[PDB]
């Protein structure tokens, strides 16, 4: 379900925004709202929720970011395209596709009304979600950003349910391990000297859509090489 | 630039003057600039306040008394609507809708009907397509600003994907030759037989299948040949 997604708002300054976000969530089928030290949750939150009062009432209220995301193994924060976030920057479409496919708890984290998220809060996210926007005017209202992300989450959920089609292949930990395994070895061999190799390698292996059998063989090859490396220090 | 400027956003009878502001803001975040109001109930400081830096859009908005004037000079007209069964032939959702707008060689009005009322029979008949936003069946009413934000966003995404297309087709005239890939397979074989990994021809067969299915780029082949050389140097250093 959309039930494993927690929507987290950090220090919402305007209490109406919380109602608007509850409404936007409910409109798309989301329910789990989390507020990290909201400035206030009040009659204005309840009024703007307009039928989504249940989402507001059931909101988890916590005093910290870490508390908000304590049992989520995937954490995504909304961000501007800051230079230092370039390797983990993603957009809502790809994000929605990642999320709907994820096994486990996911938190999507929206920052403060003007400021967004601090770098320290950003460091606590695995991916950084950027909404493509007018470069001259690229900050959304907090509830509208939630509305758009909630909307791509439902588009992705529906597309997936249109097939539920079905094919057992390779699981994502098996594959990310294949990467790390590949990275360790070829780094050891003097070959990998930056991220570029591992970027092309994943772009290739996705395209191929490795069968479980194929992952097996590429894995046995790593081991055979490791044996020789390990049998040479 | 923007061919987002050939798109007029029309808001039918807005109520709270703040809603005009919140819609102008949503538009500006996505690069839309043309706003038209039909008989707004009121426009005042709140229309400006809620625009949050999108005042220009509110200042320049048209204000008319009729749907006909509101869509003057637009030959593609899209009205938002509930999933009304009698409109089944012309109902579309925001993704398909944006692809059509973006390929439309003329001016387009997208008309946002009144919250929880929609458009009249006459107004619906005057739309070429009817735009419904997939939503919770149990709670499907977007307020005005939410609806404009989402349609504007799909519009911008349609615009970007179309402009990414116009560039990238020219941008992979480098695929390896048959002999290059073949050389790579014999090289993989030799090396992995040298290791003591290969015992039967099935490994190579499955590998060719994999790599042919992949359709290796020349630079990908380069990397993979580079790994085999990396492994080779190590083998050649042991014995």
Swiss-Prot record, chain B:
GO cellular component terms listed in the entry, alphabetical order? cytosol
By its UniProt entry, which InterPro entries does this protein fall under?
A: Alpha/beta_knot_MTases, RNA_MeTrfase_TrmJ/LasT, SpoU_MeTrfase, tRNA_m1G_MTases_N
Keywords tagged on the record? Methyltransferase, S-adenosyl-L-methionine, Transferase
The positions annotated for binding S-adenosyl-L-methionine are 80-82, 113, 133, 140-142
GO terms of biological process kind: tRNA nucleoside ribose methylation
Q: SUPFAM superfamilies recorded for this chain?
A: alpha/beta knot (SSF75217)
Pfam families, alphabetized: SpoU_methylase (PF00588)
List the Gene Ontology MF annotations in alphabetical order.
RNA binding; RNA methyltransferase activity
Q: Please tell me which top-level EC class this enzyme sits in.
A: transferase
User: Which residue windows are coiled coil?
Assistant: none
What's the EC number here?
2.1.1.-
Q: Which family does it belong to?
A: Belongs to the class IV-like SAM-binding methyltransferase superfamily. RNA methyltransferase TrmH family.
Check the record and name the NCBIfam families matching this protein.
Answer: PRK15114.1, rRNA_methyl_1
Q: What is this protein called?
A: Uncharacterized tRNA/rRNA methyltransferase HI_0380
Supply the source organism for this entry: Haemophilus influenzae (strain ATCC 51907 / DSM 11121 / KW20 / Rd)
Question: What lineage is on file?
Answer: Bacteria, Pseudomonadati, Pseudomonadota, Gammaproteobacteria, Pasteurellales
